[PDB]
Design a binder for these strands. Structure first.
Lengths: 183, 25, 605, 996, 197
DNA sequence: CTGGAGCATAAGATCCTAGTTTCA
DNA sequence: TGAAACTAGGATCTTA
């Protein structure tokens, strides 16, 4: 003897807010800032992942390992930023770029802008002129140092927590909804 | 058109009940 | 712990659920001394009191072994000052903490700030206003042609125009409206070239309307210049309406940063102005505002917790300041008594009182007994034994055989109105004729109360042929109604009395407008209504009847007090009644209660 | 659920097939049987052994009947205690075991058995040819002679009886298709040995259509014309004629159930009008399910007026005597799983019994509602209940947090500060605070009982829990005693059967609660079944009362026959037998008996077309077969020789009448036969009244001499709204927004506007914002922890940017008084905080033309009252509104224009749209030549800008979506658009002229 | 607007004593009183008396026989069912009024009390779900109309003449939810890889 | 044991461009 | 003239 229900959206919102209550309150500020700028509320998270959460669960291309957490991912990305910061602070004060006709001489003011930008790695967003040392940008206009490729491999792939939080949410809200309806 | 609603002239129902000593009491 | 003991006390009906749960949430699992002190302090505040001295808490011993429970740890635990300040729920005032400890009296922080505001207003802010004695005495003897003896009205008007804040006490039936009319005439005639925003106010709407019509008639009766008659205040308003209090919220439109823009204020009937209302009114006044209060010294107490006017007028027996007595003797031309020593010049001169009753004095038995009730019970019982003065009665209502005689006497008193109703009376005269006799009571429910008395008296006129009812109707032609909640759109106030009589155009309720007109309202439009063949003493304030009839309860109740008996005596005009056992009445008069307050400690220092 | 299903199956076995139980008590199986025997037989044997081991008596209905039959087959005539006679009236389905018992007992007691078969002859099945000769017995008439099935030699010889199957040649397809239960019952009755059978078959004269059908059923024939040969198929004069004025059987296609009952009511009134000695007792209305039709029955039979009222009595509806306290008790048993949402607990306090037990009155309920809404109560009752769901224990937004806030506000004043990171609640302060004590007593009891009801205890400890609940949460009134006694009775009965069956283990509460809830709806009421009103009832088996008018309602496909699929592992579904009973055959036989028992008129009605999408929804198979038989065995008297199919289509169209979708269609009121009695809709159908007049009317208004300045401020905040709620004093005050579900994750709208306003007013005074941030954190207003800190720091960074610009142009000032004389009309009021350079106001919002109007009015008053100075306004996103100092004559002229606009707009709804008209004026007016432009491209740009300002995007709300405008006009007509843009251009041009 | 309108009517009928909440429901769009008529009503105390008496009669009819007969008496005594039909764009409003009436009767049968029904109606105005019952009916099929239908709901039907005004319109999908072209699976990619895009 | 008061408020964002200004 | 960063305005944001 069962009872049918199709008003499942209340359960879905309750479970998604329950996950966001369990897995994002105990974060410190240095990760909560990144979470907040990715999205502000559990309603926004469910608006992102609703069409995948309903129906049959899809298969994520290149899933993250199960034994990875948000703190570990943030530590990895901040270490990756700190490495490029260390390299550029070591090798700052040299010229190996040919000043071409399309390459202005005043663009070295952006290098000093980057120098003032490096203060602390606790943030997440770099200055937009970091793409000026890109090999693809300069080839239109000579590595001589590893950072000229380190910036390339840093900027080739984006730095975010989105995949991890989406995977954890889509793996846990389904279980919470199923267990609540079973109960 | 020209139209009107029919009217029931007699009383529709009688006065019948099955009382359980409530109306008398 | 002691939560089960507190719940046992609650089921014994000696505390309140608010009291126990507030004590629990302010003390947590601390030492039981703080828990018990918080419970008794919450009960004391909820009863109507303000403060709580420590000697009360270790000298009451009413319900529980306080020592045998509160002994918890080392040290001689009778140093209750440190024993209660050790916990986080009691502070000395420097921290945001609920229980406060100021003068070895524990009381709530809201009560603390309200009492401190009241004391600061009545001790320091009340300055002295200097006016030329020659023109002042000219105005006084122009508006007061009589110059034979000690005129308390002259004294009151002089001292009230002299000081910035002036309390004017006096019994009901003294001429307080006349004194206020003289006061306003003197003030307007003194201040000519200065704009004066006069405002009148009252705590309840019925008293506000009575104040408007009384001062309107009086101030048109006194002769003034046309610009002075322009300067006469137009109308009054209920105190919440003047303050700008929102319906649901606890915000004020006239907060301390936005004072009300009115120059002089008259607060009629300040007996029921509670202490939080006094503090919230004090925060609303500007710097150059002068106020004059009114009301009896020993009327029935304020409905909300906290009484202020009694605690002010307790200093009336101190007498005037020595220099101020000579000042008043200079002004009024007669002699005023002086007070021995000195206690506080500002308070002792700001206050005034009207000793000499002028409407009905000691010659009337009502006035003699009203003067005697404030004294001991022996004078009262002696006065009612000695020949009864042919203006007051007493029936020993003890059983139903006396109760039926009481009902017969009540319908005998209501006879004229009832027979006019049976003779199809005209509206103004039947409303006038209803307002001469009215039974009173102290309780609400039971054999002695509003509902029980209404049921029994209505059944007695259902049996004896006076007026009939119908069980489907609930509205028989001739019932009295009293409106509970105020009605703004209809323009009828709380407490107003009307008779539902079927003129012929439909059974409509006819009301007595304070300007003499008659207002008819469809009963479908009536907000609320209760039958009032007998109405409570607390609802009787501000109105005066021609034949009162108080019925005391059978047993001892916490609502019956000397103040209630005195105001029920003072309600009538010319004839009084009484229905009380002598032992119960003597106990009620003898039990002189009060409210624990710290104002008496603040004023002496 | 498994044990209950198995026990139901075993009881069904006990009644119907005792041989299986006799075999399984020994231990062998039964050959030729389906699955589930392998686990059902040892279950039954173990049950017999267990109930022997419990000491309860061994006897039961499976092994008792054989001993009983053997006892009464050979004894005296009268063993003691037996009744003299016993009647069996109106039961048409009895088990074969019961019939064997009755014929065994019949030798001793004279038993009168009364049976209503619709056919007259023998219409049953046959077992064997050696059994057919046994059917050469004969029924004896009550007086006259004997008879049986007609032409009994060559009928048995012919194909009337099949090889093994039933009577294939019964004739009547209605009887063949429907009487599946009756065939088994008559085969059982004719199989008895000692029975002495007699008949009383009153005939029916075939005149009406209904009597034609009933006579064809009775005499067991078949008048339907099929047309095998063409000389038969062409001619069509051999069916019976039908009177076109004959309305015995009618079918009524309808749209929605409300319309269906509205049609039925009118037809019953017409039937009563036509037949004089017809009374509303003799009319029945039969519904497939009464719970989904009862509201419409009540609605239209109550909406009938006094002159046209015939009383109804809805029998067989589920009783709900005290439904709120029933739900309160069920939800109170559902306590330990609840999360204590504040809305649900307030729906619990909606119960008057529980409110009176905890002495909170209806005056206090409103104040508790507002206080729960504002104070921030959303979640579980304690911190322990939050932790019990394995969530972070935040502490805030709980019931205990809200009650702590309320009590701390009673002891505190809100301006003091927090105590234990709880900001006190300023409202609960006086004699009204004892409601908070009563609410906290409620919460203490709920917390104690949700702690107590958690563990699993045996039924002896579950016994007093119901009594404890009722006397601890409810105050018994005169009304509530019936429901409370019924609840205690049902709970006691459940635990009484559980204790008498000797159950010992632990039982969780959810089991008992589900059983109580499932039992509480099994008790129907039918006390007023045939008490005199028109008898509304659902179709029930073995209830065949002969009425005069039978109305069947709601016969769509799938709805009727009511489907009940068997359990699947039932062993009667695999191999059935003769007397077995199933719900499909049951409902078909009830349709047949409904057709038979209708004596005078019939009324079959079904939903034809769904009212939403105007699709097609078919009638039931039963009604379809009935209509097919009517069409195949009748013909209209006109088309005497047309065709079989043409005659069938003609009569099918003649009988079924459609019905109008909506009642005021004049097709209802056109004269004839289908003429409704609803006089209420007659002006609506005949269109006999005038349309709606326009709301804009010239109102007589006279301008007074003293106009306070707050009147002009409140007027120019919104002019149309000011006309609505200031001239004629109507205010469409909408309801309060409800309680939010959860704690604030993000803050939008007013909830952040108030925060920004307080933060900005503190920041301009150069105060540290940490104190106010702690105040908000203790208030339970900001989001939790790090998210709250992030939101606070970004709001601090925006308000710091605004307050820097405010501080850079601020001089300390004071108030001033205002008293002018403009056009002979005095202006009174005050202006707050005017400084020597003039007027300064700061406000955290976006650039709004209404606020520009507000500053412009406040500045004209100041500039007319002297005051050489400027007036500035500072907003979000570096918005600004600056006005230069003017001359006194210019200020008085502009203020004269504003006062004239006020006196016009109090008389007519002055059409100044501030945002949209402001955007249009900003698009058109050019600040270079200071002249109004006219070029068509800029007019079209202003047109589309005005529409984009009037109606917003999909996720911003434009100024159109406001009740003050929807009351005047719905769709913005271009003529009114020209009028509003003319008025806005007249009144808003000083603003864009002087904005610099 | 009709849901909010019936909320105002129910609020006025519950307490006809309160002059403000009676005038609020009297001055609405479906009774159709003029501003001049409301101004005349605010002055004639006899008119206000008879209006209050009539609304008290409605309250008694409701408390005796449910919601729908009170509404039907209101229609028959205020002529609104015919005035809306006479006013253009009125069949839609009348069908919405009758639909809300049917929903109100169906909910008020189960809902025992009276104020609970008004709270229920306000709750459904604040929370308008999109279930099967509370979807909008068609105004009339006798009125021959130009039917506008979505492409998806048009699938399976038959239309004589068809217009496709906005068929060239499209909307570029940026979201990366692509199917495999070999194994035919659902390969969600969380990143913004332009190949999967 | 019982006194009081009416009304307003907010508004999206991400991003690519044209054009503008500045500079070797 | 080539370039290149930059301020402000603009457009567009579904389906049973």
């Amino acid at each position: 003897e069962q009872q049918l229900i199709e008003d499942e959206s209340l359960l879905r919102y309750q479970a998604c807010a329950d996950f966001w209550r369990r897995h994002c309150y105990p974060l410190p500020r240095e990760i909560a800032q990144v979470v907040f700028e990715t999205w502000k509320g559990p309603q926004a998270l469910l608006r992102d992942i609703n069409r995948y959460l309903q129906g049959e669960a899809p298969v994520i291309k290149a899933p993250p390992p199960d034994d990875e957490t948000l703190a570990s991912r943030h530590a990895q990305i901040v270490a990756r930023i700190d490495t490029v910061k260390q390299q550029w602070r070591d090798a700052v004060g040299e010229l190996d770029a040919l000043i071409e006709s399309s390459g202005i001489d005043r663009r070295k003011f952006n290098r000093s802008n980057q120098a003032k930008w490096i203060d602390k790695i606790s943030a997440w967003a770099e200055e937009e002129t970091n793409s000026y040392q890109l090999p693809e940008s300069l080839e239109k206009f000579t590595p001589r140092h590893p950072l000229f490729e380190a910036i390339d491999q840093l900027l080739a792939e984006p730095l975010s927590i989105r995949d991890l939080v989406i995977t954890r949410a889509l793996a846990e809200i389904r279980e919470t909804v199923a267990r609540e309806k079973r109960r | 058109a020209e139209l009107n609603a029919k009217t029931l002239q007699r009383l529709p129902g009688d006065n019948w009940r099955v009382t359980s000593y409530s109306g008398l009491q | 712990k002691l939560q089960k003991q507190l719940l046992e006390a609650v089921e014994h009906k000696q505390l309140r659920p608010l009291d126990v749960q507030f004590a629990l949430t302010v003390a947590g699992d601390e030492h039981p001394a703080v828990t018990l002190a918080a419970a008794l302090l919450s009960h004391d505040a909820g009863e109507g009191h303000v403060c709580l001295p420590l000697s009360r808490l270790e000298n009451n011993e009413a319900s529980h072994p306080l020592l045998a429970t509160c002994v918890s740890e080392i040290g001689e635990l009778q140093n209750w000052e440190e024993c209660l300040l050790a916990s986080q729920a009691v502070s000395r005032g420097d921290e945001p903490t609920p229980m406060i400890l100021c003068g070895d009296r524990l009381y709530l922080n809201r009560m603390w700030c309200n009492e401190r505001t009241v004391a600061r207003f009545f001790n320091e802010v009340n300055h002295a206003i200097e006016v030329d004695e020659a023109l002042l005495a000219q105005t006084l003897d122009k508006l007061f042609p009589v110059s034979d003896e000690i005129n308390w009205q002259k004294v009151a008007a002089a001292v009230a125009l002299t000081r910035r804040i002036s309390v004017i006490s006096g019994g009901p039936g003294t001429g307080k409206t006349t004194t206020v009319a003289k006061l306003l005439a003197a003030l307007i005639q003194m201040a000519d070239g200065e704009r004066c925003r006069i405002r009148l106010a009252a705590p309840t709407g019925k008293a506000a309307a009575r104040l408007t019509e009384s001062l309107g008639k009086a101030l048109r009766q006194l002769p003034l210049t046309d610009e002075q008659k322009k300067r006469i205040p137009e109308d009054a308003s209920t105190l919440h309406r003047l303050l700008g209090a929102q319906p649901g919220s606890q915000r004020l439109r006239h907060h301390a940063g936005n004072p009300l823009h009115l120059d002089v204020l008259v607060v009629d009937e300040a007996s029921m102005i509670d202490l939080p209302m006094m503090s919230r009114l004090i925060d609303a006044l500007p710097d150059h505002a002068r106020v004059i209060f009114l009301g009896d010294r020993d009327q029935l107490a304020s409905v909300e917790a906290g009484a202020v006017l009694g605690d002010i007028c307790a200093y009336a027996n101190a007498g005037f300041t020595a220099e101020r007595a000579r000042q008043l003797s200079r002004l009024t031309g007669t002699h005023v008594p002086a007070g021995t020593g000195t206690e506080a010049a500002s308070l002792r001169d700001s206050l005034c009182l009207l000793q000499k009753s002028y409407r009905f004095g000691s010659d009337s038995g009502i006035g003699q007994l009203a003067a005697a009730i404030n004294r001991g019970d022996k004078t009262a019982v002696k006065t009612v034994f000695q020949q009864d003065f042919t203006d007051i009665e007493k029936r020993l209502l003890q059983s139903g055989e006396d109760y039926i005689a009481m009902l017969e006497e009540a319908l005998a008193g209501y006879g004229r109105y009832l027979d006019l109703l049976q003779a199809r009376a005209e509206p103004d005269l039947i409303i006038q004729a209803f307002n001469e006799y009215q039974l009173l009571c102290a309780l609400r429910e039971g054999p002695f109360g509003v509902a029980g008395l209404n049921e029994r008296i209505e059944q007695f006129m259902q049996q004896k042929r006076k007026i009939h009812r119908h069980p489907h109707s609930r509205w028989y032609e001739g019932r009295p109604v009293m409106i509970a909640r105020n009605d703004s759109a209809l323009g009828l106030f709380n407490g107003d009395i009307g008779i539902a009589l079927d003129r012929g155009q439909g059974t409509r309720v006819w009301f007595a407008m304070p300007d003499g007109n008659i207002k008819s309202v469809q009963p479908s439009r009536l907000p609320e209504h209760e039958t009032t063949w007998a109405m409570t003493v607390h609802k009787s304030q501000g109105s005066e009847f021609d034949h009162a009839a108080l019925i005391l309860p059978s047993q001892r109740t916490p609502v019956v007090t000397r103040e209630l008996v005195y105001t029920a005596v003072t309600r009538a005009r010319r004839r009084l009644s009484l229905y009380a056992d002598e032992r119960i009445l003597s106990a009620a008069i003898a039990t002189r209660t009060e409210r624990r307050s710290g104002l008496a400690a603040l004023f002496s220092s | 659920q498994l044990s209950s299903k198995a026990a139901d199956l075993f009881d069904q076995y006990l009644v119907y097939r005792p041989d299986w139980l006799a075999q399984w008590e020994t231990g062998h199986l039964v050959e030729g049987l389906g699955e589930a025997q392998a686990w059902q037989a040892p279950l039954w044997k173990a049950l017999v052994e267990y109930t022997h081991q419990l000491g309860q008596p061994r006897w039961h209905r499976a092994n008792l009947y054989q001993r009983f039959i053997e006892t009464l087959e050979s004894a005296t005539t009268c063993p003691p205690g037996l009744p003299s006679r016993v009647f069996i009236c109106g039961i048409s389905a009895l088990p074969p075991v019961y019939l064997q018992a009755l014929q065994a007992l019949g030798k001793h007691i004279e038993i009168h058995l009364l049976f209503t078969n619709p056919c007259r002859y023998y219409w049953g099945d046959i077992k064997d040819p050696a059994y057919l000769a046994k059917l050469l017995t004969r029924q004896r008439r009550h007086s006259f002679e004997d008879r049986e099935l007609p032409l009994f030699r060559d009928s048995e010889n012919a194909g009337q009886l099949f090889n093994s199957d039933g009577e294939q040649d019964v004739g009547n397809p209605l009887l063949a298709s429907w009487g599946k239960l009756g065939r088994d019952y008559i085969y059982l009755l004719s199989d008895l040995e000692s029975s002495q059978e007699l008949d009383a078959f009153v005939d029916v004269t075939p005149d009406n259509l209904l009597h034609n059908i009933q006579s064809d059923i009775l005499e067991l024939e078949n008048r339907a014309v099929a047309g095998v040969n063409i000389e038969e198929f062409s001619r069509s004069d051999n069916k019976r004629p039908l009177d076109p004025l004959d309305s015995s059987i009618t079918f009524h296609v309808c749209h929605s159930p409300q319309r269906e009952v509205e049609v039925l009511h009118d037809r019953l009134l017409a039937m009563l009008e036509e037949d004089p000695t017809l009374t509303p007792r003799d009319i029945i209305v039969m519904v497939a399910d009464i719970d989904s039709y009862s509201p419409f029955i009540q609605a239209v039979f109550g909406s009938a007026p006094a002159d046209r009222y015939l009383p109804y009595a809805i029998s067989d509806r589920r009783a709900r005597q005290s439904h709120p306290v029933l739900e309160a008790f069920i939800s109170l048993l559902s306590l330990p799983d609840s999360r204590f949402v504040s809305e649900d607990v307030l729906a619990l306090l909606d119960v008057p019994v529980l409110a009176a037990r905890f002495d909170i009155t209806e005056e206090g309920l409103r104040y508790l509602r507002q206080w729960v809404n504002e104070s921030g109560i959303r979640w579980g009752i304690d911190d322990d209940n939050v932790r019990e769901l394995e969530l972070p224990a935040t502490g805030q937004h709980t019931w205990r947090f809200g009650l702590t806030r309320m009590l701390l506000g009673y002891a505190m004043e809100s301006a003091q500060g927090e105590w234990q990171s709880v900001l006190p609640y300023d409202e609960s302060s006086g004699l009204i605070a004892e409601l908070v004590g009563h609410l906290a007593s409620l919460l203490m009891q709920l917390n104690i009982w949700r702690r107590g009801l958690a563990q699993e205890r045996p039924l002896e400890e579950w016994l007093p829990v119901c009594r404890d609940m009722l006397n601890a949460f409810f105050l018994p009134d005169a009304e509530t005693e019936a429901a409370m006694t019924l609840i205690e009775q049902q709970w006691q009965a459940i635990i009484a059967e559980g204790l008498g069956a000797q159950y010992g283990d632990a039982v969780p509460l959810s089991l008992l609660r589900d059983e109580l809830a499932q039992r509480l709806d099994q008790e129907r009421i039918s006390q007023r079944f045939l008490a005199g009103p028109v008898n509304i009832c659902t179709l029930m088996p073995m209830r065949s009362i002969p009425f005069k008018v039978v109305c069947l309602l709601g016969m769509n496909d799938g709805v009727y026959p009511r489907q009940l699929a068997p359990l699947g592992f039932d062993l009667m579904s695999q191999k059935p037998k003769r007397g077995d009973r199933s719900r499909r055959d049951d409902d078909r036989y009830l349709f047949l008996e409904a057709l038979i028992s209708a004596q005078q008129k019939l009324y079959i009605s079904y939903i034809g077309r769904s009212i939403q999408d105007n699709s097609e929804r078919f009638p039931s198979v039963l009604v379809q077969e009935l209509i097919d038989y009517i069409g195949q065995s009748h013909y209209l008297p006109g088309d005497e020789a047309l065709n079989c199919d043409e005659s069938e289509a003609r009569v099918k169209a003649h009988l079924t009448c459609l019905h109008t979708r909506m009642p005021f269609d004049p097709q209802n009121y056109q004269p004839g036969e289908r003429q409704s009695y609803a006089r209420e809709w007659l002006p609506a159908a005949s269109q006999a009244g005038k349309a709606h007049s326009e709301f804009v009317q010239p109102l007589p208004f006279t301008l007074p001499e003293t106009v306070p300045l707050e009147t002009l401020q409140r007027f120019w905040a919104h002019p149309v709204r000011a006309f609505f709620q200031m001239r004629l004093q109507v205010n469409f005050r909408t309801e309060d927004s409800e309680i939010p579900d959860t704690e604030p994750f993000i803050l939008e709208g007013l909830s952040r506007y108030q925060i920004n306003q307080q933060l900005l007013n503190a920041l301009v005074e150069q105060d540290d914002a940490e104190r106010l941030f702690r105040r908000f954190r203790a208030a339970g207003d900001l989001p939790y922890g790090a998210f709250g800190e992030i939101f606070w720091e970004t709001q601090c960074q925006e308000m710091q940017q605004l307050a820097d610009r405010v501080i850079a142009c601020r001089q300390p000032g004071q108030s001033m008084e205002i008293d002018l004389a403009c056009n002979g009309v005095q202006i009174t009021g005050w202006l707050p905080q005017v400084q020597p350079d003039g007027l300064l106001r700061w406000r955290p919002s976006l650039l709004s033309v209404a606020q520009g109007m507000q500053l412009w009015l406040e500045h004209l008053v100041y500039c007319a009252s002297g005051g050489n100075g400027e007036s500035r306004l500072f907003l979000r996103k570096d918005g600004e509104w600056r006005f230069p100092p003017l001359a006194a004559e210019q200020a008085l002229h502009y203020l004269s224009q504003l006062i004239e606009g006020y006196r016009e707009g109090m008389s007519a709804p002055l059409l100044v749209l501030p945002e949209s008209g402001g955007a249009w004026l900003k698009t058109c007016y050019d600040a270079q030549n200071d002249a109004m432009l006219d070029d068509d491209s800029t007019l079209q740009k202003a047109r589309t800008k005005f529409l984009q300002a009037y109606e917003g995007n999909m996720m911003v709300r434009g100024e159109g979506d406001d009740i003050w405008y929807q009351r005047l006009w719905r769709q913005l007509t271009p003529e009114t658009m020209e009028a509003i843009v003319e008025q806005s251009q007249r009144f808003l041009l000083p603003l864009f002229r002087f904005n610099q | 607007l009709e849901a909010q309108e019936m909320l105002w009517l129910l609020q006025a009928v519950m307490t006809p004593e309160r002059e403000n909440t009676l005038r609020s429901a009297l001055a609405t769009s479906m009774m159709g009183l003029n501003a001049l008529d409301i101004e005349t009503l605010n002055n004639d105390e006899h008119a206000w008396d008879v209006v209050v008496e009539e609304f008290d009669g409605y309250r008694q009819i409701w408390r005796k026989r449910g919601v729908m007969p009170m509404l039907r008496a209101l229609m028959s005594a205020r002529n609104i069912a015919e005035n809306l039909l006479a006013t253009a764009g009125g069949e839609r409003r009348l069908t919405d009024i009758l639909h809300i009436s049917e929903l109100l009767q169906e909910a008020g049968t189960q809902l025992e009390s009276e104020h609970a029904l008004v709270r229920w109606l306000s709750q459904h105005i604040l929370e308008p779900d999109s279930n099967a019952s509370s979807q909008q009916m068609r105004l009339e099929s006798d009125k021959h109309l130009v039917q506008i239908v979505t492409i998806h709901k048009s699938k399976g039907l038959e239309y004589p003449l068809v217009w496709l005004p906005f068929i060239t319109n499209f909307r570029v999908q940026e979201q990366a939810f692509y199917h495999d072209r070999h194994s035919f699976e659902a390969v969600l990619d969380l990143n913004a890889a332009p190949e999967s895009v």
